[PDB]
Amino acid sequence: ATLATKKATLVAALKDLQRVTVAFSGGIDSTLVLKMALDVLGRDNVTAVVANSELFTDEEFDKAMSLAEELGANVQGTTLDYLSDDHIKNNTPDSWYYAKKMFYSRLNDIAANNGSAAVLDGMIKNEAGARSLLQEADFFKTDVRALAQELGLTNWNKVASCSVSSRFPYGTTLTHDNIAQVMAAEKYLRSLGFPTVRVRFHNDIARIELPEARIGDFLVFNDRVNRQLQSLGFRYVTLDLGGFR
Amino acid sequence: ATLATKKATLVAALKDLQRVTVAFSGGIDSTLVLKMALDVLGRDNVTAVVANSELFTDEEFDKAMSLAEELGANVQGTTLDYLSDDHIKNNTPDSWYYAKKMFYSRLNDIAANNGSAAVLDGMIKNARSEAGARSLLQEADFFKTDVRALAQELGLTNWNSCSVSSRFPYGTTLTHDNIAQVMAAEKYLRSLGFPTVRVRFHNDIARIELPEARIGDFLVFNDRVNRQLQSLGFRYVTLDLGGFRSGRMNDTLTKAQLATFA
Amino acid sequence: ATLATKKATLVAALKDLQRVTVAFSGGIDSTLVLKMALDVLGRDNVTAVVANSELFTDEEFDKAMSLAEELGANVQGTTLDYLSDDHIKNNTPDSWYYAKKMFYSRLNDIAANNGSAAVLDGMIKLKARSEAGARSLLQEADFFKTDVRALAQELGLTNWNKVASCSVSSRFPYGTTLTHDNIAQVMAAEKYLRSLGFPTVRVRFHNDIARIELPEARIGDFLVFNDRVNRQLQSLGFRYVTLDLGGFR
Amino acid sequence: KATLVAALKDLQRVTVAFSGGIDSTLVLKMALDVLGRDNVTAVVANSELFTDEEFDKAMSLAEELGANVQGTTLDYLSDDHIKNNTPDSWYYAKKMFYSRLNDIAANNGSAAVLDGMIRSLLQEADFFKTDVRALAQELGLTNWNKVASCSVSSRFPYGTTLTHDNIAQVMAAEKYLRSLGFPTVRVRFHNDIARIELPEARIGDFLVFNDRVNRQLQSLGFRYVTLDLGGFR
Amino acid sequence: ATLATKKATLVAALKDLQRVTVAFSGGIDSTLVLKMALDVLGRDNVTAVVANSELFTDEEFDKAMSLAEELGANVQGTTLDYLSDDHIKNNTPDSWYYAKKMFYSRLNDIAANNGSAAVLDGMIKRSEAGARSLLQEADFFKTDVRALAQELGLTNWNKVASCSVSSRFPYGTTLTHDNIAQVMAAEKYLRSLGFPTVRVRFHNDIARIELPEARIGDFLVFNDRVNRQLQSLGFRYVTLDLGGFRS
Amino acid sequence: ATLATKKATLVAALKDLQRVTVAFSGGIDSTLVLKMALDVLGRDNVTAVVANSELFTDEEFDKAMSLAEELGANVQGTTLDYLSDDHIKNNTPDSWYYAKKMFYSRLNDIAANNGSAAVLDGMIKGARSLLQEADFFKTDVRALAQELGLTNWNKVASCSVSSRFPYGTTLTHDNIAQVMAAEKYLRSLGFPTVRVRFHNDIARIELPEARIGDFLVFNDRVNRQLQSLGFRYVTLDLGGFRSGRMNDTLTKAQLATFAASW
């Protein structure tokens, strides 16, 4: 279908739910849903929820909270304790399931206790107690961008967030100390101009993953990065030859 | 002139023409023309035509058709055999004209059989000879800023390319095989992060043109490119030292010696 | 307060004024003011002014003019001669105050001659601005940078000048006296460098030495351009052309 | 030079510890010249801790200098201090080396074992690398081994158990990296991680090889192939 | 099998010939033959010949000529016109054979008219022209050549064996006086920048430059200068091979 | 003329002079003169003098004096105070002459005490440059230096530190030490050929252009180290070391007018 019929589908689904709770991450999908909900139902029928957790950065949460206020939404912070579950804490291969369970269950309690008809998230085309309307309307990454520019949406988080769990090998126990170590290492690298980066944790070895197109530009920073991540507790600071992923 | 009077000129020409067929590329100018024609004459008086060829990728054909449908237009696909004209197949320096003639001839066949008064294109101020293609934006004295002024004014925000003939030296015969070879090499290079790229074809040699500011970024990919483009059929994969568009970024002395050497 | 009440105060202030002249830079603030004026008073009561001078590039002036026209405004270009004021010519710490004095004084002349009630600028929550009686309507209505963006999305604004282009005086040490020739030398050097793909760049002037500042993340990309930049900037009159090892700032 | 000639003449029958390097090569012929080919045997050790290419180049050079040459084979991994790579392993390895040479020299009637360190008669004659270079050409010597090697144990953490496999893995990886033009290189072994040390001035020249080195060192058994940002040392 | 036995064999064969002419390249093998010939037969029975051609550079001919003087030998330069043979001129895969055939035949004109018994070259462990490889008949391997060179105090030879410029041309493209000079000047310019092992491969209007891959990073600073220099030499397009040297 | 005949010219020249003094810098030229003199005249008639000054590093002095010992030459040190001359101390464009005159007067003052006839230097193609008289070129010195078994010279040319300062600048112990410490730090990093040009608070680093890409990994360490030595701004010259010598034909001629404009 055309973008007009996909948008009309979205409006009808929203009109029928009447009052919604929106899982708000700050990326372009969730920003589109949140802004479409506000324009169809108005601020007082839309609660935006932003998850605050130890597995994502303080910077991403702060920008999301302020982004929802900029979009004109009542925004709420909720705090998740992902490490309270033994599967997540010990970083087993199915941790994604226990983490997403804890998230949507908290979001269901929020929407149940404020009278919302569903929880909305930003899943698109190409979690059963969530409605992903963009995927129900057959939106693709191309469509979300087309519809966002039409509404004048302009200020979402342009770099993808993933849980810090992925920086640790399966079986490694996540702790406050070693999560903080990875977060400070990745934060410093982003501060040098590398928004997409991974510091993979191998105890005394840091393995840095960069997009291969940036590795040439990184050379000027070797020695400063070496000394900075050593001051954080790594003994060996390395650059992965395979690049990012 | 004022932007308000240039628009009134454009509507007068549209209202007077009653039924039109628009060559629609997906760029801002063809998008403006199509949307003004749709707004002045209504959906059942406007056929949007999108051309599919061997000289362009299927992806641009798909995105042009999606843009015309999203504008709410009756859209028609037509596919051309550019390689059946030997001025084009043998790639002489004027193939651009014989290609545009073949294109405008098919568009005038479409306009004759659907009862439209003219064929419209999106050429602005700063082929039609024998066809009768009217560039109403240029007839109403539109400039690139005026097209954007009217496009924001009408709520247009979603618009989208060069013929593959430019990748071959004059006299080299274009074939389905060597066209596909060039298109795949350019696509693979784009997938590595180089959106502006040309793979110039010299039979068994591939000559890659890059913006000079990216050549340093490219080195990590040399061996992968070399082996990828060798599997695409090139024997030698090379990088042009002048980069993409030679001379533009040189100093006033060697810009003048790089132009004299052309 | 809410966005919509600060919007209403802003609409009220415009309605009373009827005819306005807008100092238009192209950044998010000036474009917000200009767009609120166009939508409250109509195109025929809103003159947008863009200043042209020796201390800024022809490229930034042309984009500001094109942005105002593209947003649907009647736009006017005014050329200021900042080097005729001794305070600016001598490159002292108060040169900016005299430059903005000369700007607001010209804008009050443009506004008298087209029948405008106020001069509007894009300041949000300064001595020259008040003395000239120019109005910061966003600042009166208690806008902050987040409100400016909230309102700009609400109105569908998505192009403004994201670069904060800076006066060329910052390329000279305090006390070095600006001339037409050494300004032109630096301006051509930065224009040449931007044309190679380096949009954020400074050519600091140390008499016969040019000291180029690049973001450290770009210096590797620069290597292929060493010899061309060396000869181009010498042909502009520098004896020595150098690259700062510390980078930008 | 006068000092060196004095000491060798007095030693009558000698055996030379032959490294293949320029210093060691001086001592062999320097001696062959004053004591005769029949009473100077050159021994070159074959081990798992040094490369086959360095062993093969040394022995043929001793014949090239005109010497009775012997290859003795040392099993350094038979010592538990070496096998487990403790901080004093250099001492237990050096004992096994010089003890095998004192067996060969005792057995063939050699009066001493000599090596090339600047008994180190070259160290006794106040030689430095420059003095060694002028005198070596002086007898028309032009062929040694220009790369002076270090034991493969330094590629392993203290406490890591050396095995035939993990040594071979390290040796093939460094051999590949040298083949690409990086003669000074270390492949430090961290189980599934390979950590490459290059001189910092070569790291830029290396970029063109990232992807090939990654795949080559994985096919050698590493899961992750990395480059140390601090560089060589 | 010993070196001494191999040396004596070489000495015996030289004594037998009495008057010889040596094809002298400057490499270590041709230097060993020349020095052993001078020692066993004396200066007036040994002619050293150095070939001069369009297929090699002038400074490479001069360095071999000056090295032959350093050994104390009467050396004469001879110049070959390789481009006169169509097998070489049109660059067929057997062009190497006709060049070397033309080479050894000129050496036999010189050896006939100076009364020499054989033409000697340095092949180690031709057959048409009767040229003798005494190092090959004396069972020399690279280590024997090196051992004997040290014995005689030989330390000066060409360590970089030069290759005919024919390898810069594809099979079938015809060599001309101009396109050789074009390729040789291009390579000379690239060496002057600090890149000693390099090839400028010729593809009509395209130059395909081969560099060792580990130097390609170092090359970037010269791109534009190399581009314009080789265009001023007559190439329309100047390119760098992504596969590197001997791709 | 072969090496053989030019060497005999040199050997003939040495025998006639009987007693010599050799200006020994440690480069390839002086080492050839010094080693040829000993082989013609013996250790009892070849006085070698090596100069120590404030304009050169202690590393050069010690490296030069050690070599004369290897060549078996009687070698003595002499110390020159170049900073006592106002032409050298204030670095005017003829500073080079008054420095070389002050050098040669010490070398001839010594000549009489030695009892030597002439004083010899390594000038190639009352001083005497026998290599220059015998028609030696840079290539001839290399061939004869191998034939005589010499492989020690100082392989990188060293020049007086005066060239690191603009004409008119007063040389001091403070600024000389600053320039020398900056250069030694850069040499310590793997760049044996380097210059730190002194422009008051600006350091301008000259590198051979083939090394500049290799330098990027040290930008930050060099920036901070040279600031600690007293420079405010640390910069890299875009023209490099010996600007123009390695440029294409057109742009070499253009950088040569740029040079001669000052």
Ligand SMILES: [Cu+2]
């Ligand atoms: Cu880059």
Ligand SMILES: [Cu+2]
């Ligand atoms: Cu390098």
